[PDB]
């Protein structure tokens, strides 16, 4: 991949992408305004980066999100399009760093950085299998 | 009060794995069955929200306005993730936190989280202004 490369990913926010939907298990969240959850924003940012990386992964490889550092500065109701822009900022070993940003057509809603590590799925799968209850 | 450690325990169910974050995403649908960064962020917000609720006034709620955390080990369903939230400061409407999370086997992440106290209906209305007809 090339440092500086950009990718864009558009997402119309549905009704099941609001705060209460990230954790139906939470009574503490049932009171919240019907807005796009930060956790769902984080997911959409990761998703953009994943799509950007996909062409460049050898067979048997995947990636994990290893860090997320973002602000969430405006709220987004269902119906608006969230556009995430992902810009590759640096690569070092199995590690990639992206500058990510998100706009909902009306406001910039957040931005920051996201780090991923390329992994070998089946070695990783074995490890996650030995931590399994 | 500042320095106070609030603990929050959560048994990870199958429906908090990566593919469950975005069932819309074909990319996520093949990911390993591990607790998603986006769900960890929501869990960290949940811990802080519970820690705050006593202290809000009627009609008050809060929103996460920033998150900056690592995600350093993977968690299969069945483990309990314990979030530890510690209050760093209260400045006006802003509450600042150090958060960390552990799955009973490894520490899985840590960093910082900020939240803003809001007037629930006063905010819901602002969101209406952005809500498409």
Swiss-Prot record, chain A:
Q: Cite the InterPro entries for this sequence.
A: FlK, FlK-like_dom, HotDog_dom_sf
Binding residues annotated for CoA, in chain numbering: 65, 72-73
The record lists the effect of residue 32 to A as: Reduced activity
- Would you say which domain of life the source belongs to? Bacteria
EC number(s) on record? Answer: 3.1.2.29
Keyword entries, A-Z? Hydrolase
Active-site residue numbers: 38, 46, 72
| GO MF annotation list | acyl-CoA hydrolase activity; protein homodimerization activity
List of residues binding substrate: 36-46, 65, 116
Name the chemical reaction catalysed here: fluoroacetyl-CoA + H2O = fluoroacetate + CoA + H(+)
The job of this chain, per UniProt, is described as:
Hydrolyzes fluoroacetyl-CoA before it can react with citrate synthase, and thus confers fluoroacetate resistance. Cannot use acetyl-CoA as substrate.
Spell out the subunit comment: Homodimer.
- Stated name of the protein: Fluoroacetyl-CoA thioesterase
User: Species name for this entry?
Assistant: Streptantibioticus cattleyicolor (Streptomyces cattleya)
- Please spell out the taxonomic lineage of the organism that makes this protein: Bacteria, Bacillati, Actinomycetota, Actinomycetes, Kitasatosporales
